[PDB]
């Protein structure tokens, strides 16, 4: 009975693997071969942040272009003044191991999640000039992984017991669960139009989500080890991947199937974050190494190296307006590069 | 070229700042230990006198020293992916039973797995060996035998060297030294010298724990200063 | 939230007195506190106490015979004063005030307490008879331009009912204060500011005063009468 499952299961996906083959003419590079090269850039740091005391393990740029917020290990999650290089809030965490953040697009809220299997959401704007906690939406069984907002009312949540869900932080109960994965579900990228969301897990499978219904879409497999890391390109028609095999991809949506990957022979560390660039033209990166590098998105090379940490990249961001990017690492300083 | 407002926002920020040179300052004082034991190992009753699904914290204190404790029950089998956050800690505790000989090679494996990782290559561990009351008891009924699970404990050297305990059965010595050398054996394989281990025999119902941990925590730091002294 | 005063009654010239406001409902001490109104002139700037006791200002008129002093586990400042003259019959108010990055201060005014014994900012309209359901403009002039290097203009809109005391309307030329209705709106350009009402209807005559605060001392206006 189930050896007959599992041989229509193997000739679907045959058929599959045939049918994503047959639309493959021409690659992208060599479609790309005659364009005139972006040259060569350096930047150097603008600025320094320094007040935490331990390992930072996240941040996320403001809408506004100038504010940003931050959290670090020992238990305090604070919001800095990028022109003036001053504090705003600081915001003492109940648990101090601390994962994942993000900042709300109205503005006068963010988010906060870590080994403690509980999502807890703080309110900026209020009366009496305190930050005091609104609401603790609790329910998963593994650890905290990422967050972010779709809107005022509404947050998407990715866990480490290989599920996501989507809330409703009023009511304070799941509305839609995400159940497709076989490992530990590590990244969560959203779209420009809110309609349908990516994840990445540890199995080295992305999947396309969509946020209305609750059913899976698009499967990708192409990686040989887990993805720490996914971006989406601005266009809202393909995404970027990076594992710790020290290799990046580039998948497109409507192919179906991979498109090109970056990658050379004397980094052999693994990638913790990606970004993309306003017009799409670069592709940001950063490695165990000690530093990060800068891709081009349309022919592989090599094109720019910031260097100025003594210990691991952890996260990466780039200003919605695309004037600055922001690095943070393990040594407790977060740095601003124009 | 600076309003007052400016002059305003730079005081609020050094007043954050010193507050928070305070609040780092104190947290310091204490030491931080990770407490992991497979199953079947009675982790929970390792310290008892002295004394939120995803962490289980417990506070001990010993001659002024503070020592916070982390156990974590709310995860899965797989731990590879939140344990890069434990680098910064003391010293790692672990827990087994030897009264089960069925048992033995998986914490075996465990153990080799965790001695042999990448984010771990400066953390010394601290290991016991729990409910040997049992094993006792169990090598004494002449029911199970060694033999038949390694093969090695047929043939094997007297301990001569090694001072056993003052009066006990030559056969009990001579099984928990086997034991015992079994893991040191898995610790000394690599002979990386980075860190070290400190093996311990431990009852069901003892009342000083505490002591041990203390004089190990001790040894390490001293070993610590002793290398960044240029002495070694 | 709420602000309460004690202290005052006839005094003769010569002596000396003290006020205390207490404050209960907040956080008092990340706030920073500062005002007086003759019996038939506008509000006058008297002196101010920063948070955590690091900065003090007095006004000119006000300078070496006043002091203020605040109790943070109390949750109380006291203002002392000494070697009083027959010119300092006034009304005292206590206000609040916090200082970052998109803050609203001066959001809350106390009751104010009776006592009996530089830029110049001028506005021109005394009084002006309105229709109910009619839009209404006002204007405030200034001596130098208040536009500051950054791209903000700082002045701000009171409005003050009858018996009550003053409530934040407009802070830095264009925004909006809280509870606010949207009927209200303010715009102009460097030396040129304008507050418009459309849509008026009852329950929003009273006295209009604009304040500027680019630097100290901070002077308010001569204040507007609005009539039937």
């Known amino acids: 009975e189930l050896d007959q499952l599992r041989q229509e299961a193997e000739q679907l996906k045959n058929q599959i693997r045939d049918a994503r083959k047959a639309c493959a003419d021409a690659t992208l590079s060599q479609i790309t071969n005659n364009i005139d090269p972006v040259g060569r850039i350096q930047m150097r740091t603008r600025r320094t942040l320094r007040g935490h005391l331990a390992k930072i393990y996240a941040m996320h740029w403001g809408t506004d272009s100038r504010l940003l917020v931050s959290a670090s290990q020992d238990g305090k999650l604070i919001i800095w003044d990028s022109y003036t290089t001053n504090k705003v809030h600081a915001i003492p965490l109940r648990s101090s191991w601390v994962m994942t953040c993000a900042y709300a697009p109205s503005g006068n809220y963010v988010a906060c999640g870590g080994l403690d299997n509980i999502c807890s959401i703080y309110n900026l704007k209020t009366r009496e000039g305190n930050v005091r906690v609104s609401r603790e939406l609790a329910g998963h069984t593994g650890y905290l992984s990422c967050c972010r907002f779709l809107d005022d009312n509404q947050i998407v949540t990715s866990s480490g017991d290989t599920t996501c869900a989507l809330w409703d932080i009023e009511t304070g109960q799941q509305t839609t669960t995400f159940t497709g994965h076989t490992g530990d579900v590590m990244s969560l990228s959203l779209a420009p139009d809110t309609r349908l969301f990516v994840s990445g897990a540890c199995d080295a499978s992305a999947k396309l989500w969509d946020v209305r219904e609750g059913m899976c879409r698009q499967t990708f497999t192409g990686h040989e080890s887990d993805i720490n890391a996914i971006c989406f390109f601005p266009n809202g028609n393909a995404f970027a991947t990076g594992s710790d095999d020290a290799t990046c991809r580039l998948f497109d949506l409507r192919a179906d199937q991979e498109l090109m990957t970056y990658s050379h022979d004397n980094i052999i560390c693994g990638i913790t974050s990606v970004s993309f660039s306003k017009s799409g033209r670069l592709l940001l990166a950063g490695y165990d190494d000690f530093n990060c590098n800068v891709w081009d998105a349309l022919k592989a090379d090599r094109a720019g190296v910031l260097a100025g940490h003594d210990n691991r990249v952890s996260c990466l961001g780039v200003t919605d307006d695309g004037m600055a990017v922001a690095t943070g690492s393990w040594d407790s300083f977060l740095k601003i590069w124009n | 070229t600076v309003s007052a407002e400016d002059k305003a926002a730079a005081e609020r920020s050094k007043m954050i700042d010193k507050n928070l040179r305070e609040d780092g300052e104190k947290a310091r004082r204490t030491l931080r230990l990770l407490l992991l034991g497979a199953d079947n190992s009675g982790k929970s009753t390792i310290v008892k006198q002295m004394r939120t699904s995803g962490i289980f914290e417990t506070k001990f204190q010993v001659d002024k020293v503070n020592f916070h404790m982390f156990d974590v029950g709310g995860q899965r089998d797989e731990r590879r992916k939140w344990i890069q956050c434990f680098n910064d800690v003391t010293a790692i505790i672990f827990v087994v039973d030897s009264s089960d000989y069925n048992r033995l090679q998986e914490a075996l494996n465990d153990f080799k797995s965790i001695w042999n990782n990448r984010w771990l290559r400066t953390i010394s561990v601290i290991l016991f060996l729990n409910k040997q009351d049992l094993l006792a008891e169990k090598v004494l009924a002449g029911k199970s035998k060694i033999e038949d699970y390694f093969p090695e404990f047929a043939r094997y050297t007297t301990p001569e060297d090694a001072t056993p305990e003052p009066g006990e059965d030559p056969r009990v010595t001579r099984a928990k030294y086997f034991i015992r050398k079994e893991f040191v054996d898995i610790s000394t394989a690599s002979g990386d010298g980075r860190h070290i281990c400190y093996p311990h025999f431990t009852c069901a119902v003892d009342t000083e724990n505490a002591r041990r941990i203390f004089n190990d925590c001790k040894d390490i730091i001293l070993q610590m200063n002793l290398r960044e002294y240029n002495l070694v | 939230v709420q602000l309460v005063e004690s202290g005052g009654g006839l005094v003769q010239p010569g002596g000396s007195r003290k006020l205390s406001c207490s404050a209960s409902?907040?956080?008092?001490?990340?706030?920073?506190m500062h005002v007086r109104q003759a019996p038939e002139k506008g509000l006058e700037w008297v002196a101010y106490?920063?948070?955590?006791?690091?900065?003090?200002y007095y006004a000119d008129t006000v300078k070496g015979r006043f002091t203020i002093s605040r109790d943070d586990p109390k949750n109380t400042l006291f203002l002392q004063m000494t070697s009083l003259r027959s010119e300092d019959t006034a009304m005292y108010y206590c206000?609040?005030?916090?200082?970052?990055?998109?803050?609203?201060?001066?959001?809350?005014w106390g009751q104010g307490t009776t006592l009996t014994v530089d830029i110049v900012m001028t506005q021109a309209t005394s009084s002006v008879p309105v229709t109910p359901g009619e839009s209404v403009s006002i204007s405030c002039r200034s001596s130098?331009?208040?536009?500051?290097?950054?791209?903000?203009?700082?002045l701000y809109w009171f409005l003050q009912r009858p018996g009550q005391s003053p409530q934040l309307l407009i802070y830095?030329?264009?925004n909006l204060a809280s509870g606010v209705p949207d009927r209200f709106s303010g715009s102009g350009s460097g030396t040129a500011f304008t507050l418009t009402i459309s849509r008026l209807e009852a329950e929003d005559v009273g006295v209009y005063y604009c304040?500027?605060?680019?630097?100290?001392?901070?002077?308010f206006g001569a204040g507007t009468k609005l009539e039937l």
């Open positions: 130098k331009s208040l536009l500051h290097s950054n791209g903000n203009t700082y």
């Open positions: 304040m500027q605060h680019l630097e100290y001392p901070l002077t």
């Open positions: 830095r030329m264009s």
């Open positions: 106490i920063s948070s955590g006791s690091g900065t003090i």
């Open positions: 206000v609040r005030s916090i200082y970052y990055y998109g803050s609203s201060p001066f959001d809350f």
């Open positions: 409902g907040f956080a008092f001490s990340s706030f920073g």
